[PDB]
């Protein structure tokens, strides 16, 4: 819902660069190993994208900022301008865990405590790269932390493109303002609210919901607090970006081969993905033999959590 040509224009062209590079490399990938310029051009059409996505990413942030401020206003205009300043600070306190600075906290304040990004149709890798950065640690070494850092390293900006252009509309729908979720205004999402929210993001399976609730809720209390919500929130974005990065055939849904090459691309020991084959089937509930975002999500969890 961010209708602004300066951006639309910007997204349209960066695409041209990508649809170019994409098509360019397509060749190299099946040109007999005959006596590399493609390899040259590839590398060439690849830096431009970064530079272009870089400029585009900042125009997006500026919009979000304006959107957030513009929202805080409306809030005051309504009830007590301070009866709200608190809630945010009370909630934002639960992060008091990694080394989150004012800078990062604000990014989270925008993502998880306002509708500036929520359903705006846009998203910025730059903001996401920064947070995941100071969050990996929290995650013990292992597989899940690898999926995490794979998104951050942003190799060749392939992650940057998927976030800003390819699945930005989808990344903004997975995000939401905790205060709207929490329909009773205590700093914790109940089992009912949790469900109710997540059922409207493509998670209708009870079996999978409990999976998410079990993921978020660490201190183990039938309630979920903004800080855990933020935790579950960053995990879904991440897996959501990898789900597309793994749809090499653009068919819409991942498949055994595809999922394998990501856990592979990602550097995940075979000693950690052995029952993999059996699980994929377990998760693959409609038997399509492919996985939907909701299934890839159950999978990841099941295997590494
Ligand atoms: Ca609540
Ligand atoms: Ca809890
Ligand atoms: Ca596919
Ligand atoms: Ca399926």
201: β partners: none
d(Cα 168, Cα 124) in Å, to the nearest integer?
A: 8
Residue 139 Cα, ligand 4 centroid: separation in angstroms?
Answer: 29
How far apart, in Å, are the Cα atoms of 179 and each of 61, 92, 114, 188, 215?
Answer: 22, 11, 8, 9, 20
Residue ranges for the known binding site for Ca(2+) are 182, 184, 186, 188, 193, 217, 219, 221, 223, 228, 247, 249, 251, 253, 258, 284, 286, 288, 290, 295
Asked if residues 45 and 20 have their Cβ atoms less than 8 Å apart, the reply is yes
What is the distance of C-alpha 2 from the center of its chain?
19
At 14, list the tokens.
Answer: 């960066």
Helix (H) or strand (E) holding 145: helix 144-153
56, burial (CB in 10 Å: exposed 0-12, middle 13-18, buried 19+): buried
d(Cα 126, Cα 123) in Å, to the nearest integer?
A: 9
Question: In 3D, which of 48, 51, 43, 50 has the Cα closest to residue 24?
Answer: 43
Q: Start-end ranges of CATH 1.20.58.90 in the chain?
A: 1-76
Class for the domain spanning 77-174: mainly alpha
Helix (H) or strand (E) holding 57: helix 37-77
Q: Start-end ranges of CATH 1.10.238.10 in the chain?
A: 77-174, 175-305
We find that the CATH architecture of domain 175-305 is: Orthogonal Bundle (1.10)
d(Cα 210, Cα 35) in Å, to the nearest integer?
A: 56
Enter the CATH code of domain 1-76.
1.20.58.90
Asked if residues 175 and 237 have their Cβ atoms less than 8 Å apart, the reply is yes
What is the distance of C-alpha 258 from the center of its chain?
19
Q: Count Cβ neighbours within 10 Å for each residue of 44-54 and write b for 16 or more, e otherwise.
A: ebbeebeebbe
Question: CB within 8 A of 232, min separation 6: which ones?
Answer: 212, 215, 216, 224
d(Cα 114, Cα 88) in Å, to the nearest integer?
A: 10
Ligand nearest to the CA of 250: 3
Residue 275 Cα, ligand 4 centroid: separation in angstroms?
Answer: 18
Measured in angstroms, the resolution is 3.1
As residues whose CB is below 5 A from the ion ligand 4, the structure lists 286, 288, 290
Q: At what angle do helices 102-112 and 226-245 cross, to 10 degrees?
A: 80
d(Cα 227, Cα 97) in Å, to the nearest integer?
A: 9
Ligand nearest to the CA of 225: 2
Helix (H) or strand (E) holding 290: strand 290-291
Region of residue 224 (left: phi > 0; alpha: psi -120 to 50; beta: else): beta
User: How was this one solved?
Assistant: X-ray
Ligand nearest to the CA of 187: 1
Residue 192 Cα, ligand 2 centroid: separation in angstroms?
Answer: 14
d(Cα 138, Cα 218) in Å, to the nearest integer?
A: 12
């Amino acid at each position: 819902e961010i209708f602004s040509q300066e951006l639309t224009q910007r997204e349209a062209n960066v695409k041209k660069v990508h649809e170019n590079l994409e098509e360019l490399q397509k060749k190299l990938d099946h040109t007999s190993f005959a006596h590399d310029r493609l390899e040259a051009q590839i590398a060439q059409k690849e830096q431009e994208q970064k530079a272009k996505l870089a400029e585009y990413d900042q125009k997006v942030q500026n919009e979000f900022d304006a959107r957030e401020r513009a929202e805080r206003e409306r809030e005051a205009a309504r009830g007590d301008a301070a009866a709200e300043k608190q809630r945010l600070a009370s909630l934002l306190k639960d992060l008091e865990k990694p080394m989150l600075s004012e800078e990062d906290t604000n990014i989270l304040r925008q993502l998880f405590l306002s509708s500036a990004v929520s359903g705006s149709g846009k998203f910025s890798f730059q903001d996401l790269k920064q947070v995941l950065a100071k969050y990996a640690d929290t995650i013990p070494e292992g597989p899940l932390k690898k999926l995490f850092v794979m998104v951050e390293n942003d190799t060749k900006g392939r992650m940057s493109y998927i976030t800003l252009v390819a699945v930005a509309n989808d990344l903004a729908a997975l995000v939401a303002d905790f205060r709207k979720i929490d329909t009773n205004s205590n700093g914790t999402l109940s089992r009912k609210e949790f469900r109710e929210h997540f059922v409207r993001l493509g998670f209708d399976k009870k079996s999978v919901q409990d999976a998410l609730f079990r993921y978020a809720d660490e201190d183990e209390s039938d309630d979920v607090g903004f800080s855990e919500y933020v935790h579950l929130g960053l995990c879904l974005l991440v897996l959501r970006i990898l789900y597309a990065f793994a749809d090499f055939d653009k068919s819409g849904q991942l498949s055994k081969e595809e999922v394998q090459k990501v856990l592979e691309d990602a550097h995940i020991p075979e000693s950690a993905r052995k029952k993999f084959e059996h699980q994929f089937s377990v998760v693959d509930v409609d038997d399509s033999k492919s996985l939907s975002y909701q299934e890839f999500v159950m999978l990841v969890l099941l295997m590494f959590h």
